[PDB]
């Protein structure tokens, strides 16, 4: 139940589904491919 995906790292560019860490953004944006599927055509609330 406790927090699962800890979003407390060093690098500024951190994922949202895995809160990973990366040096550049390109790596992150593209890295999001590992989470393919969820295609929200609209904005998110929380
Ligand atoms: Zn990720």
Swiss-Prot record:
Q: Give the transmembrane ranges.
A: none
At the top level of its lineage, which domain of life is listed?
A: Eukaryota
Q: In which tissues is it expressed?
A: Ubiquitous. Mainly expressed in fetal tissues.
Subcellular localization is given as: Nucleus
Q: Where are the zinc fingers (C2H2-type)?
A: 13-35
Q: What does the protein in this record do?
A: May be involved in transcriptional regulation as a transcriptional repressor. The DEPDC1A-ZNF224 complex may play a critical role in bladder carcinogenesis by repressing the transcription of the A20 gene, leading to transport of NF-KB protein into the nucleus, resulting in suppression of apoptosis of bladder cancer cells.
Q: Summarize subunit and interaction data from the UniProt record for this chain.
A: Interacts with WT1. Interacts with DEPDC1A.
Spell out the family assignment given in the record's similarity comment: Belongs to the krueppel C2H2-type zinc-finger protein family.
Name of the protein in its database record:
Zinc finger protein 224
Q: Which organism is it from?
A: Homo sapiens
Tell me the stretch of the parent sequence this chain holds: 479 to 511 of 707
